[PDB]
Amino acid sequence: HAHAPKVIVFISGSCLFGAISRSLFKKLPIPYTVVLLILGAILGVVASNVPLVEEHTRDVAHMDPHVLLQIFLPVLIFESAFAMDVHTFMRSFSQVCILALFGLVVASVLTAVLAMNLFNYNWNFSEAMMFGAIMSATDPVAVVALLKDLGASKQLGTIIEGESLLNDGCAIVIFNVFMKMVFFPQLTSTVGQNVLYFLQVAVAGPLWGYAVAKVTVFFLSHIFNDALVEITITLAATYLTYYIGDIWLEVSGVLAVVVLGLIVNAEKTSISPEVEVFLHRFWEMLAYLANTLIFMMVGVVVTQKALVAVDKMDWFYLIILYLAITIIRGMVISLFSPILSRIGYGLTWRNAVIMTWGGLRGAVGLALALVVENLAGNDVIGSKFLFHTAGIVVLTLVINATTIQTLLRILGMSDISIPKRLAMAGAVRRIHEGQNRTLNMLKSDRFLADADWDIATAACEISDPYSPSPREFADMMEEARLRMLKAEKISYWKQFEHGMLAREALRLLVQHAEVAADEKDQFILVDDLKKSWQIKGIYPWLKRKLEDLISEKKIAAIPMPKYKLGKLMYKICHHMAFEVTINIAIVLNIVPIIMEFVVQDKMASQKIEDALRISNYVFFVIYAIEAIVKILGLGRHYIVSHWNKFDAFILVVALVDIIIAETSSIKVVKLFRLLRGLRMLRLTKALIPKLILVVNGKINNQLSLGYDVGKGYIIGEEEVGKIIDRMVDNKKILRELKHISETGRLQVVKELGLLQREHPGIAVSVKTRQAIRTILNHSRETIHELQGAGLLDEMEAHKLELTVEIKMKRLMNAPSSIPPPPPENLLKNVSWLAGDMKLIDFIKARASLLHFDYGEVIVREGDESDGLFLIVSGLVKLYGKSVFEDYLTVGNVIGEMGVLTKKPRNATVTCETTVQVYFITAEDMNIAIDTFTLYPSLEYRLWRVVAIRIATPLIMEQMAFQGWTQEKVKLHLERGYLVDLAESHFQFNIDATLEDVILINGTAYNAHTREEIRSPCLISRTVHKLTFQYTATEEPRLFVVRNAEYN
């Protein structure tokens, strides 16, 4: 009917035009957005002549400014923020801010002066500043897209993107400031009044955004199965942050959304992964809709209202303006180049050109132009604002956006590095080989013999998109160095693919490897990695100081009252419900404190101020009973704590002012100010624990990243060290490489072991978090394995896989600090004790806790193996000639092999810190071995623990070249078991059911050749059968792993 929404046809039609442009002009260098402007112009000219069409474009063309800003800008700004690589953005935050904020001011002011002097429009400074503001809002989406692939992607790409984000955010702020001075002027403004205005837009805005962000991520972390709720919460937070910010709080909405976008982006872990991928594609779609509409709207109104008021001179000014804003941006970048070069990633002269040429203008500039074109009404200023802004957008998108592709070439930035070319060629060649095998396999199929292979081969063709002498010695060294660093990069990627590394640690390690590859004679330096696990000094100090404030040890020392009258209260005094009730009462006291006092201020409603006085009586009564109960429970010791004395002062205030108030204006203001100022501050007692939790969280986030980088490096080095043994020939080179790897590994394992001592609880939290995450991951795999085998139905598989998903989400809410378990708990958790309560009691009764000081030697080489140590606290350094060094920390048990083979100790143990060890004597272990002999025998368990640790190096060395990482090998061995040579004193291999057989201890004879095999050897696949000697000196033990099919 006549009331039908006519914006539906325009909005939907805009989508179709966007699709058409985006499709047809996909290959041409001209960006599609230019075509949208042409189509908008066509709609404008045709609309002016055909009244029917005008009825459909009017509602959206002639659209109120506020509705333009309130709906579109939050989408554009949030989407831009939500799409950033925050981690890189933060690491270059200063460099972006200097160039964005200060650069924006100078760029706009210089443009403003140009507009005033050059143009004959006779604009004043306010209008010229609006012009400069809308002329300095960039939109480099087309340029960062190219930089994403070709080169210089990591640093340059995000710097231009972040700079554009911040200058867009600030340009709107400047535009808002100067628009009110032009279209909504005010009679007067004081200096102090303006300063408060600055604080609101510049300081309060970001704080409002930060508060809403931290509230949002809190709830998102507590939504477990509703994806729709997560998406809706994101939408509502984004729009309410802007609306409440601009309209109710009058703080800067755009900056609030910028901060909200960045915080929510950083806290992506709080969003379920499946939702995360949705949101990225969702906000992209919303931003794409916003761009398509704004460009078509400009195309419409520019022809209907703007081009009718354009003189020949205006065209001349547009060219001069385009040249000016281009050289101005370059001047700003160069001028700050000395500063920017000394922070973050310094700008090379070629990078500067990219930033200068890549400063495309776009939607935000146009959107703000439409506001002026609307507010100005019939004034020419509106038309000429829209004309120039549209002109600059067209010129930049025609000239800059098309030639940037060639400029990146001329500057020699698009070249693909040799490593990438080689990797792509190898991958393509392997794929090409993979298809030939598949193609042959199909040709043998009876049901596909008649298929047209000429077409099949042509269709499935993947094509490469990119198409002793010192001089001798140094050459191999450079070759080896690069062949090593390349291996590491692989080992990091393998770890990530198997969920062993967080993405951030992977990025750091790969970045360091790449940097080392570019430099000369450079390997990975741990000194560069240290920045990952160095805790900033502020946080430990804050944690210590805050924990001192609520120490309250002087209350814990208070004894029970000496008579029954106080005994009952004392119990209440230590019930959490008491403190919770008092806190709730206090926080409820805000309602009177605000309502009555603000009402009295307004009067300065008498019945309200008369009535609320009674609530003061009620809260006084509550606090009085609280004080009475506390004094009765504690007695004279009550006054000891400083927190209590503050409450005594508060009650003194209550008595004094409630009496005096009931009994000039000074008394009333005294009552109000004193009640408000004091009674709210006693919440800090309950607040401080939350601050401690926040601090823990900040430390945990840093320490966790440290462990990943440190542990990622160690595993990478361990894997590589068994590869270079066969990747390089020259022994001298080989020896030099491994020496560096070990001197790096020792530093990492030491420093990373000292952090645990500095922050015990946080370390335990981090580690238990890793433990759970690993368990769930491999728990997820079995579900896929069961699903893939068809052994479990798809719907049932999904039902299980949900419980894993919610479980992995609840990790993020786990406490940042777990109190370290006491020593007795460690014994309970030793690998070869778990579950055997009878054995645990036997050991716990005979384990003697010892304490050592720095530098003491627990055991020395050649000493008889008198027992084994479990390190419950500290860090010990092992230095054994069978040269070979290591550092062991909490949990690790020393001497497991010694008590079994009864052979002298292999390494000297020195304490790097104050160490505590549970010492179990060899005699006790022998007794335990003799007295605990069920199927999972203690001797069997001990050997199994040792066996795997001995086996893992052998299997790695034998199959490092293949695709298995360490975790896979260790799990692989986990399926194994030790054979009882008493059940059969000879072992017969079965190649179809035994995957690997390892000899751990004792000599074994080849049954046919009667060759003797040394103890730690990995039995070669060629051996058919083994015969074992029987001597007391070395009883032979053997480890085997069967195929999945149980024998």
Numbering used by the authors: 71 to 537, 570 to 706, 725 to 783, 794 to 1012, 1031 to 1195
Structure paper excerpt:
One example is the sperm-specific SLC9C1 that belongs to the SLC9 superfamily of cation/proton antiporters, known as Na+/H+ exchangers (NHEs), which are essential for the regulation of intracellular pH, sodium homeostasis and cell volume. The transport domain (TD) is accompanied by a voltage-sensing domain (VSD) and a cyclic-nucleotide binding domain (CNBD), which are regulatory units usually found in voltage-gated cyclic-nucleotide-modulated ion channels, also referred to as CNBD ion channels. In a recent patch-clamp fluorimetry study, the functional integrity of the domains was confirmed for SLC9C1 from the sea urchin Strongylocentrotus purpuratus, termed SpSLC9C1, identifying it as a Na+/H+ exchanger that is activated strictly by hyperpolarization and modulated by cyclic nucleotides (cNMPs). Specifically, SpSLC9C1 adapted to mediate cellular alkalization in sperm only in response to chemoattractant-induced hyperpolarization.
A general observation, evident from the local resolution maps, is that in all of our SpSLC9C1 structures the protein displays substantial structural heterogeneity for most of its domains except for the TD, which indicates that it might be locked. Focused 3D classifications at the dimer level could not resolve the conformational flexibility, which suggests that the movements of the domains are, to a degree, independent within the dimer. Therefore, focused heterogeneity analysis at the protomer level with a mask excluding the TD was performed instead. For the apo dataset, four conformations with a resolution range of 3.2–3.4 Å and with substantially improved densities of all the domains could be distinguished. The most pronounced differences are confined to the region of the CHs. They are accompanied by subtle conformational transitions in the VSD and CNBD, which further indicates that the CHs might play a central role in coupling voltage sensing and cAMP modulation to exchange activity in the TD. In line with this assumption, the extended cytoplasmic region of S4 forms several interaction areas with CHs, which have to rearrange upon voltage activation.
